[PDB]
Amino acid sequence: PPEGGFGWVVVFAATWCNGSIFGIHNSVGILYSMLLEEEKAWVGALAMGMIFFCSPIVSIFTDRLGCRITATAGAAVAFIGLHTSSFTSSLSLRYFTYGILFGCGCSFAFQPSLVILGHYFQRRLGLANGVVSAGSSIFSMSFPFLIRMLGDKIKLAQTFQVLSTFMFVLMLLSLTYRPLLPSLAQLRKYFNMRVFRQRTYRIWAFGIAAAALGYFVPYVHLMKYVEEEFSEIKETWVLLVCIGATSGLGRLVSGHISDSIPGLKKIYLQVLSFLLLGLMSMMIPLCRDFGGLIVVCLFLGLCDGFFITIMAPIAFELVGPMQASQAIGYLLGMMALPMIAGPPIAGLLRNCFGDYHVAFYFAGVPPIIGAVILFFVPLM
Amino acid sequence: PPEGGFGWVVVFAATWCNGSIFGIHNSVGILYSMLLEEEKAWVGALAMGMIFFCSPIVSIFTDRLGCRITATAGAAVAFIGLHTSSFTSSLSLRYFTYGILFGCGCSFAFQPSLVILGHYFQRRLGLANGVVSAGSSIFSMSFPFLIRMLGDKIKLAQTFQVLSTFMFVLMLLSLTYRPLLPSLAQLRKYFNMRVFRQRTYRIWAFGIAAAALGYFVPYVHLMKYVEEEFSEIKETWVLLVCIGATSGLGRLVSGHISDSIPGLKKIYLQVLSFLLLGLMSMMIPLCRDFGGLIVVCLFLGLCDGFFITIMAPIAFELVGPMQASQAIGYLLGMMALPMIAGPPIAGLLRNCFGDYHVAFYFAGVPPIIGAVILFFVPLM
Numbered sequence: 001p002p003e004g005g006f007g008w009v010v011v012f013a014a015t016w017c018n019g020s021i022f023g024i025h026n027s028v029g030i031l032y033s034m035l036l037e038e039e040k041a042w043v044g045a046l047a048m049g050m051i052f053f054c055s056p057i058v059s060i061f062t063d064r065l066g067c068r069i070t071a072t073a074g075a076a077v078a079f080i081g082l083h084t085s086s087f088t089s090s091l092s093l094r095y096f097t098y099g100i101l102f103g104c105g106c107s108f109a110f111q112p113s114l115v116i117l118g119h120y121f122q123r124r125l126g127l128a129n130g131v132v133s134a135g136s137s138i139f140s141m142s143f144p145f146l147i148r149m150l151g152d153k154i155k156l157a158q159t160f161q162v163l164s165t166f167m168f169v170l171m172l173l174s175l176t177y178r179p180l181l182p183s184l185a186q187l188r189k190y191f192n193m194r195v196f197r198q199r200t201y202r203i204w205a206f207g208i209a210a211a212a213l214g215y216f217v218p219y220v221h222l223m224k225y226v227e228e229e230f231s232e233i234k235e236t237w238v239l240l241v242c243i244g245a246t247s248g249l250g251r252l253v254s255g256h257i258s259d260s261i262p263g264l265k266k267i268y269l270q271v272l273s274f275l276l277l278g279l280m281s282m283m284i285p286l287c288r289d290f291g292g293l294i295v296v297c298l299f300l301g302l303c304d305g306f307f308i309t310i311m312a313p314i315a316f317e318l319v320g321p322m323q324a325s326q327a328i329g330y331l332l333g334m335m336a337l338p339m340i341a342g343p344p345i346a347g348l349l350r351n352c353f354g355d356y357h358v359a360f361y362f363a364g365v366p367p368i369i370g371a372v373i374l375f376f377v378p379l380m
Numbered sequence: 381p382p383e384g385g386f387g388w389v390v391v392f393a394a395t396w397c398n399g400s401i402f403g404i405h406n407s408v409g410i411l412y413s414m415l416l417e418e419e420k421a422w423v424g425a426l427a428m429g430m431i432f433f434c435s436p437i438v439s440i441f442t443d444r445l446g447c448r449i450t451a452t453a454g455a456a457v458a459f460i461g462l463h464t465s466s467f468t469s470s471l472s473l474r475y476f477t478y479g480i481l482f483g484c485g486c487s488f489a490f491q492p493s494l495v496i497l498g499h500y501f502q503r504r505l506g507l508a509n510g511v512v513s514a515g516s517s518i519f520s521m522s523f524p525f526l527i528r529m530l531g532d533k534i535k536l537a538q539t540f541q542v543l544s545t546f547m548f549v550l551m552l553l554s555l556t557y558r559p560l561l562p563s564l565a566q567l568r569k570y571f572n573m574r575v576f577r578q579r580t581y582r583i584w585a586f587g588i589a590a591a592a593l594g595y596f597v598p599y600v601h602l603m604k605y606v607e608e609e610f611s612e613i614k615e616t617w618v619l620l621v622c623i624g625a626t627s628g629l630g631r632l633v634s635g636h637i638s639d640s641i642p643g644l645k646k647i648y649l650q651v652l653s654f655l656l657l658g659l660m661s662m663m664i665p666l667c668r669d670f671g672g673l674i675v676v677c678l679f680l681g682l683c684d685g686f687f688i689t690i691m692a693p694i695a696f697e698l699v700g701p702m703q704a705s706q707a708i709g710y711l712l713g714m715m716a717l718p719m720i721a722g723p724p725i726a727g728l729l730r731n732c733f734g735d736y737h738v739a740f741y742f743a744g745v746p747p748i749i750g751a752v753i754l755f756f757v758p759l760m
């Protein structure tokens with residue numbers, strides 16, 4: 001492949017996808033507040049989980065139709081969802097219009113964004129994925145502040161209109177996904193399940209799906225933990241700045257260095273990104289000083305980066321460019337449920353003991369189990 | 381060409397363009413009213429005239445870029461114009477955002493919609509143009525009532541958002557323009573002016589440009605004339621129904637029958653539309669009865685249909701499928717000024733004498749002169 005040229009354009013488009021999806025999701029809570037201030041928590045998770053739960057279908061549509069058509073359709077559906085959100089005034093139409101439309105369109109627009117990078121970059125696929133991931137991370141962490149500032153000025157409908165504008169620009173950028181590689185019986189044709197005929201992929205996906213609960217618990221619950229335990233410190237934005245900076249840096253660096261790792265050995269990066277996190281999840285209760293929290297945030301971002309930034313290229317390397325959309329889609333589908341179920345269970349455990357210690361101690365285990373499971377994949 | 385199949389799909393898309401552009405323009409006045417009701421004319425004409433005045437540049441793109449790219453870009457610009465209209469709250473930013481953006485995007489999206497029809501239909505080009513024109517007419521005369529109903533319910537920003545999603549669907553449909561036939565020095569390359577090397581095209585375009593003032597005066601000024609002179613009749617919607625029905629019927633019929641006329645003889649149809657209308661324009665200040673007004677409306681619609689519905693295929697026939705975008709664009713550009721200037725001059729004439737008699741008498745002449753000019757084009 002070119003490993004450059006028009007590929008870089010695609011990278012930009014890919015970035016505009018990720019940061020504009022997750023970022024918008026990061027704003028959901030703010031939007032909820034808006035609603036309350038105009039009328040004086042599960043739909044937000046449903047819409048976000050629809051990105052990964054519906055990915056297996058997007059994989060089929062990507063193998064059959066293509067990256068461009070699927071991405072454009074998903075972007076159009078997301079635009080329509082945000083549009084009808086701007087128009088709807090209800091608590092039942094909001095659920096349908098946001099979740100079923102916007103999240104599904106996000107899934108359809110998000111699945112092909114990695115397969116296209118795989119189309120254009122082979123030797124420098126890791127670096128392109130790292131660029132996309134770092135840009136997406138920065139944009140996602142920056143979006144909610146802009147949404148809050150808009151809320152201070154305009155109402156909810158206008159905000160939904162701006163989000164639909166973001167989705168519109170996304171769909172326009174999605175047309176740069178120019179194909180570069182070739183492309184009851186119908187039920188068995190669409191669900192052949194050929195990637196699950198390889199032990200390496202099976203065990204890799206199983207480990208990644210097993211790690212997700214405890215992988216995602218700390219990131220959601222750190223802010224609440226610091227707010228509860230540490231009430232006498234006012235510089236809480238330092239934590240966010242540290243996490244974001246180190247996470248973007250780690251994403252870029254991991255994407256770069258994953259290219260120099262010959263074969264399946266890059267899987268080892270992921271284990272470390274699960275090992276330390278695991279261990280880190282069991283030392284958050286032990287932090288008595290601000291500096292300890294800062295160090296934990298640095299390590300949290302470092303662990304966050306590698307996982308995603310190589311999970312994409314490792315998915316492309318395990319099975320090949322042909323069976324890459326399917327592998328990515330089913331990895332995402334398997335991760336869909338545990339990631340959503342984790343933080344809820346962490347909160348439930350917190351409510352049953354009055355402290356986050358047990359929640360973090362239990363969330364530190366699944367990542368370690370996943371790391372141990374993944375450690376044995378490169379050995380065969 | 382196919383003269384069918386996917387071409388019909390294009391026809392639908394083409395329809396969605398025309399009816400959705402002109403219809404939206406027909407709503408401008410209503411929008412203005414809403415603005416006043418929230419704060420208690422030239423901009424509307426400028427935005428509409430940008431469709432035809434800017435067509436020569438759209439012709440240059442359509443021949444170097446293509447119908448699909450130009451149509452999508454124009455639709456995107458129109459969407460952005462309606463968006464920023466929904467957001468802006470001012471009397472100077474409104475002018476820019478509506479006129480310069482929406483009208484120019486409408487020009488860019490509207491010019492290729494005829495060239496693509498010519499691409500797909502050659503032997504049945506007239507019928508496709510007639511279908512597009514009839515659907516466009518019905519949609520245009522149906523839009524303002526729906527806009528009024530929406531205004532009675534929601535505010536101006538939401539109405540602009542609805543128009544924006546109309547433009548969005550238009551842009552989505554404009555991707556079905558798949559090409560079917562091939563595609564200081566740069567200044568002379570873009571402005572070669574080769575269609576003007578043909579005397580037939582020169583005289584045809586000159587006659588069509590000369591007729592426009594008086595061609596378009598009666599349609600705008602008939603409602604005002606009946607409101608002023610006929611104040612004792614309350615069934616004024618019968619006039620609109622007659623005009624719309626007969627105009628759509630005439631568009632379809634003229635488009636269908638122009639295919640049976642071998643060569644340049646179809647130009648004669650246009651001269652009839654210029655002759656009768658002329659005479660009709662001179663007989664409006666002679667109707668003492670409601671039935672006479674109904675007959676005049678029927679004849680007005682009949683004259684309206686043929687002109688447009690054959691102006692497209694005759695433009696394609698005079699110069700060929702290669703120099704068709706250029707011919708259409710420059711015919712539109714030449715028509716741009718007189719069509720805008722006409723009704724204003726008719727109103728100015730009405731003011732200075734206290735009645736519409738002289739205005740209609742003067743507006744009846746330019747169409748007759750254009751008919752006489754065009755009569756001699758098929759003779760050589």
Ligand SMILES: CCCCCCCCCCCCCCCCCC(=O)OC[C@H](COP(=O)([O-])OCC[N+](C)(C)C)OC(=O)CCCCCCCCCCCCCCCCC
Nearest residue numbers: 068069072073076077080175449452453456457460552555
């Ligand atoms: C309830 C839900 C309802 C859902 C409704 C359905 C939604 C989805 C429907 C559409 C999805 C279907 C697939 C879409 C089509 C994708 C494929 C396709 O058509 O081809 C793509 C086409 C080309 O694809 P192609 O495949 O034909 O390319 C040709 C390749 N060969 C020859 C091999 C076949 O892409 C384009 O070329 C279009 C380019 C348009 C450029 C647009 C530029 C816009 C610039 C805007 C600037 C605005 C800012 C300016 C502001 C100024 C302010 C001052």
Ligand SMILES: C[C@@H]1CC[C@@]2(OC1)O[C@H]1C[C@H]3[C@@H]4CC=C5C[C@@H](OCCC(CO)CO)CC[C@]5(C)[C@H]4CC[C@]3(C)[C@H]1[C@@H]2C
Nearest residue numbers: 026029140141144145148219220240243247300301304305
């Ligand atoms: C490895 C990385 C860990 C971080 C991360 O995963 C990746 O986890 C996600 C959770 C997100 C936060 C959720 C809620 C809020 C509160 C909101 O509060 C308004 C202001 C406030 C004070 O003024 C009240 O007014 C501001 C935004 C913020 C902090 C989000 C930022 C982005 C975050 C950190 C996301 C990011 C992708």
Ligand SMILES: C[C@@H]1CC[C@@]2(OC1)O[C@H]1C[C@H]3[C@@H]4CC=C5C[C@@H](OCCC(CO)CO)CC[C@]5(C)[C@H]4CC[C@]3(C)[C@H]1[C@@H]2C
Nearest residue numbers: 406407409410520521524525528599600623624627681684
């Ligand atoms: C055949 C030719 C094609 C072009 C053309 O005909 C000639 O197409 C016609 C459509 C007309 C509009 C239709 C409807 C309305 C609503 C009305 O609302 C008053 C109140 C009422 C509810 O609307 C209830 O009493 C105001 C006028 C307006 C905007 C017309 C303006 C003139 C227009 C644009 C005409 C235009 C010259």
Ligand SMILES: COc1cc([C@H]2Oc3c(O)cc([C@H]4Oc5cc(O)cc(O)c5C(=O)[C@@H]4O)cc3[C@@H]2CO)ccc1O
Nearest residue numbers: 018022045133136137216219220308339340341342343
């Ligand atoms: C609300 O309940 C939950 C919330 C979350 C949030 O926590 C994270 C997180 O830690 C990491 C991501 C990254 O995910 C990716 C996956 C990919 O495959 C590719 C990528 O480019 C990305 C990134 O860009 C994303 O930043 C996303 C999120 C969720 C909010 O964005 C997780 C689990 C939950 O249950």
Ligand SMILES: COc1cc([C@H]2Oc3c(O)cc([C@H]4Oc5cc(O)cc(O)c5C(=O)[C@@H]4O)cc3[C@@H]2CO)ccc1O
Nearest residue numbers: 398402513516517520596599600688719720721722723
């Ligand atoms: C406000 O000042 C003016 C207003 C008007 C309005 O009167 C007409 C009219 O009589 C006919 C059209 C048709 O024009 C076309 C031209 C084409 O090349 C192809 C087509 O498909 C169409 C049609 O669909 C249109 O219906 C448009 C309009 C204007 C409002 O729509 C004219 C001159 C003015 O100065």
